[PDB]
Amino acid sequence: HHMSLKFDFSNLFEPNISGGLTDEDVKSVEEKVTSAVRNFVENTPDFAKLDRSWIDSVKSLEDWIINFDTVVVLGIGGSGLGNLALHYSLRPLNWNEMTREERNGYARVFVVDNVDPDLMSSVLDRIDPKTTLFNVISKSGSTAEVMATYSIARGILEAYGLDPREHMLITTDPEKGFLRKLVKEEGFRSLEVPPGVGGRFSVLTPVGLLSAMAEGIDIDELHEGAKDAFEKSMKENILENPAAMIALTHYLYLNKGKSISVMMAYSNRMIYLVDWYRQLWAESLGKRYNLKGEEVFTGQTPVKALGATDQHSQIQLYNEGPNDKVITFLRVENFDREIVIPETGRAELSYLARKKLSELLLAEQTGTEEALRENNRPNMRVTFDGLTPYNVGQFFAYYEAATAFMGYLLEINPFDQPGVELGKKITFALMGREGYTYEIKERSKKVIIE
Amino acid sequence: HHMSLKFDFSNLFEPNISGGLTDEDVKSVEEKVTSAVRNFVENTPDFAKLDRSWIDSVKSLEDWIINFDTVVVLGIGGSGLGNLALHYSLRPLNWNEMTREERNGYARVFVVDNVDPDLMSSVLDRIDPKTTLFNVISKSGSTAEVMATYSIARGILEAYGLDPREHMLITTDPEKGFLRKLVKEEGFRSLEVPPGVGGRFSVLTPVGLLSAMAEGIDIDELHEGAKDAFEKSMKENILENPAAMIALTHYLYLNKGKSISVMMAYSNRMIYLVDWYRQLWAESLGKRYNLKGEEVFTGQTPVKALGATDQHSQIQLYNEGPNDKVITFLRVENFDREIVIPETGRAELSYLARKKLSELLLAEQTGTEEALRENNRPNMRVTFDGLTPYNVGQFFAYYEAATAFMGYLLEINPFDQPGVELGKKITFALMGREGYTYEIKERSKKVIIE
Amino acid sequence: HMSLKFDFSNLFEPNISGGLTDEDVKSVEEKVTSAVRNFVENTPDFAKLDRSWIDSVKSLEDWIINFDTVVVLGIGGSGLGNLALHYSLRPLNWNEMTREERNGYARVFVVDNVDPDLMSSVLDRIDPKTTLFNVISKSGSTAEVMATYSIARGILEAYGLDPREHMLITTDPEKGFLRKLVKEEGFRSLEVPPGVGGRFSVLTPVGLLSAMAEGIDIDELHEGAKDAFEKSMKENILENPAAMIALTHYLYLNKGKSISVMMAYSNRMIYLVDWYRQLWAESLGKRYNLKGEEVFTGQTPVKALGATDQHSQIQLYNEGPNDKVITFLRVENFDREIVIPETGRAELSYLARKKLSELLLAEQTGTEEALRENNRPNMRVTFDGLTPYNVGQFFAYYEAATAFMGYLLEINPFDQPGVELGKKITFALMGREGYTYEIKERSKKVIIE
Amino acid sequence: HHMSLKFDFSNLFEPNISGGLTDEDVKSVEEKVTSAVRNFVENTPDFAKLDRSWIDSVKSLEDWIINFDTVVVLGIGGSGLGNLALHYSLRPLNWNEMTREERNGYARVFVVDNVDPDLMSSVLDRIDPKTTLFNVISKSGSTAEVMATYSIARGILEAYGLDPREHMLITTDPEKGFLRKLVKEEGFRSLEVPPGVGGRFSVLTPVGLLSAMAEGIDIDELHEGAKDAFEKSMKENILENPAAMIALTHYLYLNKGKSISVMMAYSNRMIYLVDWYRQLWAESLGKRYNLKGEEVFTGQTPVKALGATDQHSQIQLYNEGPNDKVITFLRVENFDREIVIPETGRAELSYLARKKLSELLLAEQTGTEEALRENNRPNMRVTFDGLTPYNVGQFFAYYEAATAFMGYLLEINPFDQPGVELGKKITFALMGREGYTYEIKERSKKVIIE
Ligand SMILES: [Cl-]
Ligand SMILES: [Cl-]
Ligand SMILES: [Cl-]
Ligand SMILES: [Cl-]
CATH number at residue C429: 3.40.50.10490
How far, in Å, are C154, C187, D10, D28 from residue D24 at the CA level?
Answer: 55, 62, 16, 6
**What distance in Å separates the CA atoms of residue D71 and residue D217, rounded to the nearest whole number?**
14
| Dihedral sign of CA atoms C61, C64, C69, C70 in order | negative
**What distance in Å separates the CA atoms of residue C226 and residue C239, rounded to the nearest whole number?**
16
A165: number of Cβ within 10 Å: 12
Q: For chain A, give the longest Cα–Cα distance.
A: 73
The phi, psi pair for A112, rounded to 5°, reads: -110, 95
Helices C218-231 and C388-408 cross at an angle (nearest 10°) of 40
Q: Which of A155, A180, A215 is the last residue of a domain?
A: A215
How far, in Å, are B67, B96, B182 from residue B130 at the CA level?
Answer: 10, 17, 22
Residue C136 · residue C205 · CB < 8 Å:
no
**What distance in Å separates the CA atoms of residue B389 and residue B203, rounded to the nearest whole number?**
13
**What distance in Å separates the CA atoms of residue C154 and residue C143, rounded to the nearest whole number?**
16
Q: Are residues C274 and C223 in the same domain?
A: yes
Q: Going by C-beta distance under 8 Å and a sequence separation of 6 or more, which residues neighbour residue A244?
A: A33, A34, A36, A37, A233, A235, A238, A402, A405
3-state SS, residue B288 = coil
Which is it for strands C5-7 and C107-111: parallel, antiparallel or unpaired? unpaired
- Residue C83 CA, chain-centre distance (Å), reads 8
Amino acid letter for position A190: S
Residues near ligand 4 ion, CB 5 Å cutoff: C 302-303; D 303-304
Residue D382 · residue D330 · CB < 8 Å:
yes
CA atoms within 13 Å, Cβ hemisphere of C345: 19
Indicate the DSSP class of residue A444.
S
From the list A294, A128, C285, A101, the residue with the least C-alpha distance to D315 is: C285
C-alpha C361 to ligand 3 mean position (Å): 36
The phi, psi pair for D240, rounded to 5°, reads: -115, 5
From the list C159, B125, B307, the residue with the least C-alpha distance to A96 is: B125
The phi, psi pair for C250, rounded to 5°, reads: -70, -45
- D218: burial class by Cβ within 10 Å (0-12, 13-18, 19+)? middle
**What distance in Å separates the CA atoms of residue D24 and residue D11, rounded to the nearest whole number?**
17
D185: number of Cβ within 10 Å: 9
- D443: burial class by Cβ within 10 Å (0-12, 13-18, 19+)? middle
Q: How many residues does chain C have?
A: 449
Active-site pick, B6, B49, B130, B424: B424
Residue D364 · residue D329 · CB < 8 Å:
no
The total number of structural domains in chain D stands at 2
Q: What is the 3-state secondary structure (H, E, C) of D255-289?
A: HCCCCEEEEEECCHHHHHHHHHHHHHHHHHHCCCE
Answer yes or no: A283 catalytic: yes
Q: Are residues A225 and A169 in the same domain?
A: no
Residue A161 · residue C116 · CB < 8 Å:
yes
Q: How was this structure determined?
A: X-ray
**What distance in Å separates the CA atoms of residue B21 and residue B246, rounded to the nearest whole number?**
13
Q: Going by C-beta distance under 8 Å and a sequence separation of 6 or more, which residues neighbour residue D153?
A: D72, D74, D134, D136, D167, D168
| Dihedral sign of CA atoms A176, A182, A183, A186 in order | positive
Q: String of b and e for A209-247 (b: at least 16 CB within 10 Å)?
A: bbbbbbbbbebebbbbbbebbbebbbbeebeebbbbbbb
Which is it for strands C69-73 and D325-332: parallel, antiparallel or unpaired? unpaired
Residue A353 · residue B434 · CB < 8 Å:
no
Helix runs in C160-269, H state only: 177-185, 205-213, 218-231, 241-254
Q: String of b and e for B427-450 (b: at least 16 CB within 10 Å)?
A: bbbbbebeeeeeeeeeeebebebe
Q: String of b and e for B210-236 (b: at least 16 CB within 10 Å)?
A: bbbbbbbbebebbbbbbebbbebbbbe
CA dihedral (C400, C402, C407, C412) in degrees, to 10, reads: -120
* A34 contacts chain B (CB < 8 A): no
Amino acid letter for position D148: A
- A443: burial class by Cβ within 10 Å (0-12, 13-18, 19+)? middle
From the list A339, A375, A369, the residue with the least C-alpha distance to A356 is: A339
Indicate the DSSP class of residue A321.
S
Measured between CB atoms, which of B102, B338, B342 is closest to C160? B338
Residue C408 · residue C250 · CB < 8 Å:
yes
Q: First vs last Cα of chain C: how many Å apart? A: 59
* Secondary element (H or E) of residue D82: helix D81-90
* D38 contacts chain B (CB < 8 A): no
- Residue C418 CA, chain-centre distance (Å), reads 20
Q: Are residues B99 and B139 in the same domain?
A: yes
Please report the DSSP string for C148-165 in residue order.
Answer: HHHHHHHHHHHTT--GGG
From the list B230, B192, B233, B218, the residue with the least C-alpha distance to B37 is: B233
Residue A19 · residue A376 · CB < 8 Å:
yes
Residue B235 · residue B172 · CB < 8 Å:
no
| Dihedral sign of CA atoms B144, B146, B149, B151 in order | negative
How far, in Å, are A133, A208, B133 from residue A165 at the CA level?
Answer: 10, 21, 47
**What distance in Å separates the CA atoms of residue B202 and residue B212, rounded to the nearest whole number?**
13
List of long-range contacts for C91-98, beta carbons under 8 Å, 24+ apart: C91/C268, C91/C335, C91/C336, C91/D118, C91/D121, C91/D122, C92/C267, C92/C268, C92/D118, C92/D119, C92/D122, C93/D122, C93/D125, C93/D126, C94/C214, C95/C125, C96/D97, C96/D126, C97/D125
**What distance in Å separates the CA atoms of residue C146 and residue C135, rounded to the nearest whole number?**
9
Answer yes or no: A166 catalytic: no
CA dihedral (C299, C304, C307, C308) in degrees, to 10, reads: -140
From the list B382, B380, B264, the residue with the least C-alpha distance to A446 is: B380
Q: Going by C-beta distance under 8 Å and a sequence separation of 6 or more, which residues neighbour residue C85?
A: C202, C207, C210, C211, C216, C221, C391
Q: Are residues C106 and C63 in the same domain?
A: yes
From the list C202, C225, C309, the residue with the least C-alpha distance to C261 is: C309
- Residue A167 CA, chain-centre distance (Å), reads 27
Which is it for strands D260-265 and C324-331: parallel, antiparallel or unpaired? unpaired
Sheet order of strands, D301-306 included: C447-448, D6-8, D379-384, D325-332, D260-265, D301-306
* B342 contacts chain D (CB < 8 A): yes
Which is it for strands A6-8 and B448-449: parallel, antiparallel or unpaired? antiparallel
Helices B242-255 and B23-42 cross at an angle (nearest 10°) of 130
Residues forming a β-bridge with B73: B111, B135
Q: Are residues D235 and D129 in the same domain?
A: no
3-state SS, residue B200 = helix
How far, in Å, are A96, A98, A195, A428 from residue A106 at the CA level?
Answer: 10, 11, 30, 39
Q: Are residues D374 and D426 in the same domain?
A: yes
Which is it for strands A379-384 and A6-8: parallel, antiparallel or unpaired? antiparallel
Helix runs in A313-420, H state only: 315-320, 357-374, 389-409
* A124 contacts chain C (CB < 8 A): yes
Q: Are residues B144 and B181 in the same domain?
A: yes
Residue A245 · residue B449 · CB < 8 Å:
yes
Q: Is the peptide bond before D378 cis (omega within 30 degrees of 0)?
A: no
From the list C425, C449, A161, C116, the residue with the least C-alpha distance to D384 is: C449
Q: Using the beta-carbon criterion (under 8 Å), do B447 and A323 form an inter-chain contact?
A: no
Please report the DSSP string for D313-376 in residue order.
Answer: TTHHHHHHS-S-EEEEEEEE---SS-PBPPP-S-GGGTTTTTSBHHHHHHHHHHHHHHHHHHTT
From the list C274, C259, C351, the residue with the least C-alpha distance to C305 is: C274
Residues forming a β-bridge with D71: D109, D133
Indicate the DSSP class of residue C189.
E
| Dihedral sign of CA atoms A446, A449, B1, B2 in order | negative
Indicate the DSSP class of residue D236.
S
Residue of A nearest to B241 (CA): A449
Q: For chain D, give the longest Cα–Cα distance.
A: 73
Amino acid letter for position B331: R
3-state SS, residue D167 = coil
Q: Which of B215, B247, B267 is the last residue of a domain?
A: B215
Q: What is the 3-state secondary structure (H, E, C) of B110-147?
A: EEECCCCHHHHHHHHCCCCHHHEEEEEECCCCCCHHHH
* A130 contacts chain C (CB < 8 A): yes
Q: Going by C-beta distance under 8 Å and a sequence separation of 6 or more, which residues neighbour residue A41?
A: A234
- Judged by its nearest atom, the ligand closest to the C-alpha of residue B281 is 1
Q: Are residues C304 and C224 in the same domain?
A: yes
Interface test with D, best of A101, A130, A158, A165 (most D CBs within 10 A): A158
How far, in Å, are B311, C88, C198, D214 from residue C214 at the CA level?
Answer: 50, 12, 22, 34
Q: For chain B, give the longest Cα–Cα distance.
A: 73
Please report the DSSP string for C354-410 in residue order.
Answer: SBHHHHHHHHHHHHHHHHHHTT--EEEEEESSS-HHHHHHHHHHHHHHHHHHHHHTT
Residues forming a β-bridge with B206: none
From the list D258, D78, B155, the residue with the least C-alpha distance to A342 is: B155
Rg (CA), chain D: 23
Helices A271-285 and A81-90 cross at an angle (nearest 10°) of 150
Amino acid letter for position B224: E
**What distance in Å separates the CA atoms of residue B246 and residue C13, rounded to the nearest whole number?**
101
A434: number of Cβ within 10 Å: 10
3-state SS, residue B450 = coil
Q: How many residues does chain B have?
A: 450
Measured between CB atoms, which of B116, B278, B351 is closest to A313? B278
* D450 contacts chain C (CB < 8 A): yes
**What distance in Å separates the CA atoms of residue A333 and residue A5, rounded to the nearest whole number?**
11
- Judged by its nearest atom, the ligand closest to the C-alpha of residue C259 is 4
Active-site pick, A1, A292, A312, A445: A312
Q: Are residues D206 and D228 in the same domain?
A: no
Residue B310 · residue B325 · CB < 8 Å:
no
Helix runs in C75-176, H state only: 80-89, 116-123, 143-158
Residue B404 · residue B414 · CB < 8 Å:
yes
List of long-range contacts for B63-66, beta carbons under 8 Å, 24+ apart: B64/B189, B65/B107, B65/B133, B65/B210, B65/B213, B65/B214, B66/B105
Q: Are residues D24 and D106 in the same domain?
A: no
3-state SS, residue C174 = coil
Q: Are residues D247 and D167 in the same domain?
A: no
Residues forming a β-bridge with B168: B134
Amino acid letter for position B230: F
Indicate the DSSP class of residue C435.
-
Angle at C401 between CA C400 and CA C407, to 5 degrees: 95
In which domain, by residue range, is B374 found?
1-51+216-450
- Judged by its nearest atom, the ligand closest to the C-alpha of residue C61 is 2
From the list B285, B401, B391, the residue with the least C-alpha distance to B47 is: B401
Indicate the DSSP class of residue C80.
H
Residue B168 · residue B188 · CB < 8 Å:
yes
Helices D81-90 and D389-409 cross at an angle (nearest 10°) of 140
Residues forming a β-bridge with B260: B301, B325
Please report the DSSP string for D216-231 in residue order.
Answer: T--HHHHHHHHHHHHH
The phi, psi pair for D289, rounded to 5°, reads: -105, 145
Q: Are residues D209 and D245 in the same domain?
A: no
How far, in Å, are C345, D422, D426 from residue D437 at the CA level?
Answer: 21, 12, 8
Residue D135 · residue D108 · CB < 8 Å:
no
Please report the DSSP string for A190-239 in residue order.
Answer: EEE--TT--GGG-TTSHHHHHHHHHTT--HHHHHHHHHHHHHHTT-S-GG
From the list A90, A305, A49, the residue with the least C-alpha distance to A208 is: A90
Residues forming a β-bridge with B111: B73
Please report the DSSP string for B9-46 in residue order.
Answer: -GGGBTTTSTT-B-HHHHHHHHHHHHHHHHHHHHS--G
- C116: distance to nearest CA of chain A, Å? 7
Q: Which of B168, B190, B215 is the last residue of a domain?
A: B215
Amino acid letter for position A342: P
- Residue B91 CA, chain-centre distance (Å), reads 16
**What distance in Å separates the CA atoms of residue B66 and residue B131, rounded to the nearest whole number?**
10
